[PDB]
Each structure stands twice: as C-alpha cells, then as structure tokens.
C-alpha cells in the first residue's frame, strides 16, 4: 500500500484447517493481485513460484501464495488432500483477496496441479477473475487416474486401493477416485476472459497435450510452447515462464 | 454384534471438523449396514430418518446417520457447507463403515440433498456400495441454482452473491456456484448395482422429474411414485417410504 511494502506471512482457515501463505505487498493505494497455486507435493516457495511473485511485485502487482492442505506449512495430512479440497482451499483464499479494499483486478496463476485448481476456480468465478495463467496445467491427472498410473505408481483404476504408497508419502484412494471424474474442461471452459497457457515441449510429467487441449476449450487463450523446457521451467528456462506470466498480467 | 445391541452416539472427523452420528447396532457377528444422509437444513434425526433406521434395525441391518457439516450437532457454519463438502463428509463416514469388521454389505440411503450426496458417492465407489435408495433426491438443486431461485429466494445465477440470506440462515455463494456445475447424473450413472427411487407425486420441493431422470440414467433402478405424498413422506405417507426402503435392502 502507500505506507507498507514487502513480504508478510498470512494465515487463513478452511473447514477447521489452517492454511499458511505469503503476501507480496506492492506500492500504491490500489493495485491488482495474483493468487499463485503450487502443484502436487510442491509448496508455495518453489523457485518458480517465488520468481513469479518477485517479478509481479517489481510491476506493482501484489500476490499471495498459500500452501494447499496436506502441503508445506498448512494443516491436514497429505493422504487426505484431493483436487476438490484444494479447490475449496483456493475458494477460501479468494474470499480473503476479494474482500481486500486495495485489490482492483484479481488474477489466477497455477502450475501443474495448481493450474487445474486455477482453471476450475476461474470457471466457478468467471464474473470475478480477470485473467488466468496456467503453467503446465496437470489436466492429465484425470486421464492418469483412469489409466491407473500416477507418475509411475500403478493400481487398478476400476478398484482404487484405500491408500497408495507414493515415494515418501501416502496418496489417498479418494484423491484418485475424485481425479477420474473431475469435470476439468467443462468447468474451466466457462471462463471466457484472457488465458495464457505456458508449457515446456520436453515436459515429462504433464504432456504438452494438456495445454493444447486447454487452448482448444477456451474462448480467449494464447498458447506458448517453450522449446526444450521441462515441467518446472528449471534453470535456463525459468525466465521464459516468469516473463510470459508477468507480461500477461501487466496488460 | 453378538453381545451389544442398541443405539450409540459416534463421532468422526473430516478436515478438522467433527461430525456427530448415531449408530444402530443390531444382533449378530456379521450384518449389512446402511449409511443414511439427511437433506438441506435437516438433521440426522428427522422422523423419516429415525423410522428408516428403526425399521432396518428390526431386520438386523445396522445403520449410521450423521449430521452433515453446518448441520445439527456437527461442526462448521451452515454458510460454509456445499454439496461437495457434504460428499467429503460422506466419504469420511464411509471410511468408518468400510473398516468395521462386522460390516458385510454397505448400502446408501439419501433423502433430498442427501440423495444427491448418496448418488454421487455411489458413483465414486461403485465397486464397494451394494445398493442405493434415493428418497426425493434433490438433483433439481443444480437446475434451481442455474435458474437463480433456491426454494423461493432469488438471485442472479450469472453473478451469484457472496452470501444469500435464506429464512433464518445464510447460504454461501460458493454452495450456489458449486451447485450450478455439479456433475450429478454423470457421476451417479457409474453405479450399475440396484437402485430404488422413491418420490411423492405431490412433492412441491423437489419435482418428481428428478427421480424420473435418475430412473433413465441408471442401469438397474426401480422407480416408486407415491401417489399424494409430499417431500418428507409425512404422516400417512411415511410407511410407504420406510417399507420400500426396508424391503429393498433386505433383498
Ligand atoms: Na508440511
Ligand atoms: Na462430468
Ligand atoms: Na483463443
Ligand atoms: Na482459445
Ligand atoms: Na447446529
Ligand atoms: Na460436467
Ligand atoms: Na432400470
Ligand atoms: Na434404470
């Protein structure tokens, strides 16, 4: 605002769970604000999300970035997280943002499973959200759950187990049952304002076909295929993601 | 079980909210169990739900019936309830039931908005749930939200308000935004085991067309239109609901 600029740890509640976030507060009495969503097993402070928030703040666009339930600093077990209750988290965050009297336009920015949360939240609030940026949006998590193979762990999609050991973690069976039937494109397509789609051609985690499919479903989308980039836009590719996202939201 | 029979208040947790339920425990080491779901602004102990549980217990079929979040004895504000987080409650209850070693087959019984929760939960667990009974299932809540008229309170469906005063209560705007886009028939139609549909011809709250539509979508449904009955199967109509539900679950 006019008097305070910089970072601040902030906390919200959704159904009895605390969610922990970081707010980047820019100069000025009135400013736009992006809500930034991390992906599956990530957190609000990955290099990509930090550099997005930093670049936005340089342009005086505020942002907030929260850990989803079951992630990072927030409450809840990872095993109890699903894409649906992450959309419920995202709605609690949007409650916080849309009632801040300094906030002019609201933008959603989502990476990977956070891109599905962003795209679906924008389709539920198409009258409020002004622009969306999806980075490698993980709409393929539905097709993966239907196949029975979530990033190399396999299971019977017709009889999903109660829980699924997953590296160091335990994935809920209810996450997978929800994933199989999520109306990702149906809900997301209701957002007819500008969308920017950014996907690396060498993403091994989410097929670029996900963004190609979003680009067909949206009324107003621009697709950027970043030649050679991986799922996280790591190292030499990071600035491609950061620049496109910042340029998109500045106008 | 073999040693204890009768009622018991039971408590479960979903995301930091306590849910309060009543278990009817029948005779025998092994028995089937129905999970019974109340409707919008109701509670686990309406006359209809009590008499259903009582009649089932006479047949040695166990049951549990919980207050949804935002209702009755359970945690959470009514304003924060949606059909989606009631499905999340229902999944926490099913976790409890499917891990009880006395439980043989599991049945879902839902009245009104509880019928939508039941039908959608059965479509997410079509491999586990054995039979479903829907009583006046409120699948019309989606069409109502799209129209902008929820039981006589009106609003702009293209720009749903943050909150909607509703009699003595405050309905969340997010309830309505979710309702408009709920994939009720898509998800429910995945359950191909036996379904019993019970609807009163003079229901003024949920059009009988809801059960007529479910009867077309299911692979194995039986439709019972109760001549003259109202939304709650009150007074002289109650036994029509209770008898059909009990007969259905006994075999
Ligand atoms: Na953590
Ligand atoms: Na669907
Ligand atoms: Na376009
Ligand atoms: Na497009
Ligand atoms: Na209460
Ligand atoms: Na749908
Ligand atoms: Na049939
Ligand atoms: Na049928």
Author numbering:
A (entry chain A), B (entry chain A): -5 to 245
Q: What is the paper's account of this structure, in its own sentences?
A:
We previously showed that LJ0536, a cinnamoyl esterase purified from L. johnsonii N6.2, is active towards a variety of substrates including short acyl chain aliphatic esters and phenolic esters. The structure showed a canonical α/β fold characteristic of esterases, and the enzyme is dimeric. Two classical serine esterase motifs (GlyXSerXGly) can be recognized from the amino acid sequence, and the structure revealed that the catalytic triad of the enzyme is formed by Ser106, His225, and Asp197, while the other motif is non-functional. The structure revealed a prominent inserted α/β subdomain of 54 amino acids, from which multiple contacts to the aromatic acyl groups of the substrates are made.
We determined the structure of the active site mutant (Ser106Ala mutant) and also co-crystallized this mutant with ferulic acid, ethyl ferulate, or chlorogenic acid. We validated that the active catalytic triad is Ser106, His225, Asp197, since the Ser106Ala and Asp197Ala mutants displayed no catalytic activity. The apo-LJ0536 structure was crystallized in the presence of protease, which facilitated successful crystal growth (the mutant Ser106Ala was also crystallized in the presence of protease). Overall, we observed no appreciable differences in the backbone structure between the apo wild-type (WT) enzyme and the Ser106Ala mutant (RMSD of 0.33 Å over all 244 Cα atoms). Trp160 of Est1E corresponds to Phe160 of LJ0536, and Phe160 adopts the same conformation in the apo and each of the ligand-bound complexes. The bridge-like structure formed by this residue in LJ0536, which lies on the first hairpin of the inserted α/β subdomain, is present in the same location in both apo and holo structures.
